[PDB]
Design a protein around this ligand. Structure first.
Ligand code: NAP
Ligand code: NAP
Ligand code: NAP
Ligand code: NAP
Lengths: 246, 247, 247, 246
């Protein structure tokens, strides 16, 4: 009965690998009907393969309003309205400011910040009608700490928290909570990229002495998604091994 | 199952006779922990024994008395093998505007709400290091982060809990121990039930959720941080306040 | 004297026709800076020229238009040698509850309040690096830290300003440039004068100081961060809010 | 007229060297009548030597209520009531928790936290009568970040901020502001202590690439002390070269 999501419909954007996959799997373990998304049809099918009778994968581009609308209609049709939205889809377009292109700025705003606006708005009417809901944004320690060469990504991840706090204020009295989980450096395809010196240097900033695991983010998201977290709203739950302490 | 499972862990929860501490103790027992809850009185310690049953026991502890701390921890070590999860929940208020605040109101709070965290945390740390696994969870307050008129002593102690938590977290992270604070908003307990009708109405007006929190809601946050699943969370303050304050 | 002295520095203050930006511009000129203040209109740009007199000049700038940015910065470089102190003050609101919020209300805010900071900051940075000295000061808002119903777009932009500020600060600190945000509470300007009587009363009730702030009070904080005396402050948010929020 | 303190009486605790000396000197430059303190009579005289006709040094132990009372009476007698209180006096008693003595804990609570309570209370009646005042606490980045081997110091410096916020709420409507300046690592006698590896390691955590100067803390304190900072209360002004970004 602890942390039970039976009866809830969850949408996890960008569930094909790493953190989003871990989130989608754990939410299904806890009893939710889960819809995970990828940017391609084959990616969507790979999600359906791992969810089995616990849900389905769908193709979604969170920068395209028509895609968002089609996906939410399909979910409502087959499963009913979204009770738990996890805004996990996100990208990087790293560069020092001196080298940062207009398109690198805009791609990050569109994918990592504006998406959260669009998806949150799109699921909110259903949640307000039922007087119950969860929105959980996947932020980053970089949103709080800043990082050289990621001024775009940091702006977007910080903006997500300001959005979250304001939305939380609007919807709290109607039983909807809005929160962010901010991972530190987690072992995924974003990371295996870093070279050895960079990895060693990232690790040296972590008291725990290791990168996080995707499952560790999934656990934090599942906790905030639960009935037991009803009195948490407008909050950022930092899961970073002590890399930053707020 | 093995999800949020605390089987095999020994938990000490200070001030488990009522309120938030009682809810913490009951939930940690539900999750499989062997729980020792404490009260300042023998009647409270027996009431804790009674509600825990085969899942644990109650002991009398005054967290301002080092001899009491030493005795309780020895009892726990002798029988159960010593503390894997420490929940520093015991705390009090001694409210007054600063111009009316007595030296004893200041010291009572430092001793009960802040120095207690230093003493208890130090006393359990050796055993946790040896096992390469531990959890310390301090119960802070939204007031530590926000401040509150009439509670400068309480606010200083609760803010100081976080400073301690961050420092200890940096010291012990590489040996498998996490140290974190859960900071409740206004929770329905005897401490809240203190406020008059006007003050309660005015407090509720500050909470977006439009209600006080339930002790169980703090227990859930504590149980989550106590779990194996929270091993990458350390030096963190988890705010459970209905939106009263947002960090 | 040489205390908080800005003689020899070129300051660009966006949105200096009224409100907080006007007060910033007037104070930076008082402290010795050569000030270029901007308005969206030629009448406003001339009014700025008129109040600055021999201490500076006004120019028309729309911070959402990259051609306008390029033209203004070239004018400043050609005449005055380019910007030593950038104050990103220009900003707007497009308030609505989320369920009523239009795509254009979201985009107008991202563009005016957030992307403008990226564009202007990038455009002045090369010159500041070359000189091994610079100041960028962004005007944020208490709303970026606290959130506010009806302002999710504004709050996201203002919070995003801080994320940008921290990252840029880390990039440019070792080359003599500091990057910081001043986050005002509710300040008496046309933006505040927006609120109805009930809303204004309710806003004042949230401010311990019991008044709105004055534009001059934000100008003072900006002037302090712009000074040589603030060289060890970077990546910081200086809150000027009468106690409305406390971090 | 900018940052003018003419007519104000300032008490700076622990003004014999480093940060406190810099604070006392700058406040006097800006026109305040300054009383700086040391723990000895010779220390007090050294303060009187540098202040000259701008003020005086006094012997004060901020852990002793009778000393506090005597010092405030002497100030009221000679200068009038304290308008600006700068709580700068502070010590370290470093140790890993495993080695931390009860006396090392208590000395830090008494000197660094309880002192702020006692002095603040003692100056507040005068400030509330006049409907104008400034209290500025000298915190530490360690209060916000934490630091291994300084759990006592971090507790005390963090507690100072919770105290400050609560006091600010009580006194704001009567024209008194209460704030903290949180230095990063500043070149003083606290620091020259660190060995070369430790210095190098501290510096590597600072984007600015240098330790701060005492004058840099003095400037921040003088700004908060000014009439121009009337709308700042309950705030922490971080002066740390980017070592931590809040
Ligand atoms: N990895 C880390 O250390 C780390 C740390 C902190 C925060 N985060 C945050 O965690 C989230 C997931 O990160 P991750 O490391 O697991 O990333 P990942 O491995 O790169 O996966 C990203 C996911 O987002 C999807 N996606 C990208 N653009 C999209 C778009 N326009 N519309 C819909 N979906 C899109 C991808 O779809 P496809 O599979 O079809 O490409 C993919 O499933 C991101 O928000 C990230 O910023 C990550
Ligand atoms: N709204 C809230 O209630 C709220 C909000 C935020 C934070 N908190 C914090 O949450 C914690 C629990 O509060 P609560 O509301 O549940 O309080 P409560 O109902 O007053 O319960 C206090 C508990 O602490 C014990 N205790 C008190 N002094 C002690 C001492 N010197 N030594 C050992 N135990 C002692 C009490 O034992 P006895 O039963 O024997 O007296 C009791 O079990 C406290 O740290 C409090 O500051 C409360
Ligand atoms: N309570 C407050 O007033 C408050 C609180 C916190 C933060 N702030 C922030 O403080 C800043 C100044 O606000 P305020 O209250 O003084 O505002 P205001 O009175 O509305 O003044 C706005 C200024 O920005 C200029 N501006 C607007 N849009 C622009 C654009 N697209 N390009 C270039 N300039 C543009 C305006 O030019 P025109 O005169 O030509 O229209 C004007 O000079 C804003 O960033 C605001 O978000 C205000
Ligand atoms: N140095 C740093 O990097 C640094 C960084 C962050 C924050 N801080 C904080 O800044 C403040 C000043 O530090 P600092 O580095 O300049 O220190 P310092 O060089 O050690 O000077 C400390 C001052 O406090 C006085 N003092 C000590 N105990 C006292 C007591 N019981 N009663 C009255 N006065 C007492 C000393 O008096 P005597 O001269 O008579 O001994 C001295 O004037 C402290 O609060 C410190 O925690 C320092």
């Amino acid at each position: 009965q602890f942390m039970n999501l039976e009866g809830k419909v969850a949408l996890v954007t960008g569930a094909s690998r790493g953190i989003g996959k871990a989130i989608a799997e754990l939410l299904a373990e806890r009893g939710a009907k889960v819809i995970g998304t990828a940017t391609s049809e084959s990616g969507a099918q790979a999600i359906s393969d791992y969810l089995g009778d616990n849900g389905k994968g769908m193709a979604l581009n969170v920068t395209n309003p028509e895609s968002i609308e089609a996906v939410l209609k399909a979910i409502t049709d087959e499963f009913g309205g979204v009770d738990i939205l996890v805004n996990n889809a996100g990208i990087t377009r790293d560069n020092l400011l001196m080298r940062m292109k207009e398109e690198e700025w805009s791609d990050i705003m569109e994918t990592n910040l504006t998406s959260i606006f669009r998806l949150s708005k799109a699921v909110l009417r259903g949640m307000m009608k039922k007087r119950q809901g969860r929105i959980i944004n996947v932020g980053s320690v970089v949103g709080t700490m800043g990082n050289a060469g990621q001024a775009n990504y940091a702006a977007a991840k910080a903006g997500v928290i300001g959005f979250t706090k304001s939305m939380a204020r609007e919807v709290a009295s109607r039983g909807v909570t809005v929160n962010t989980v901010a991972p530190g450096f987690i072992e995924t395809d974003m990371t295996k990229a870093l070279n050895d010196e960079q990895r060693t240097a990232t690790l040296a900033q972590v008291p725990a002495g290791r990168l996080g695991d995707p499952r560790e983010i999934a656990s934090a998201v599942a906790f905030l998604a639960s009935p037991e977290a009803a009195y948490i709203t407008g909050e950022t739950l930092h899961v970073n091994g002590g890399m930053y302490m707020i």
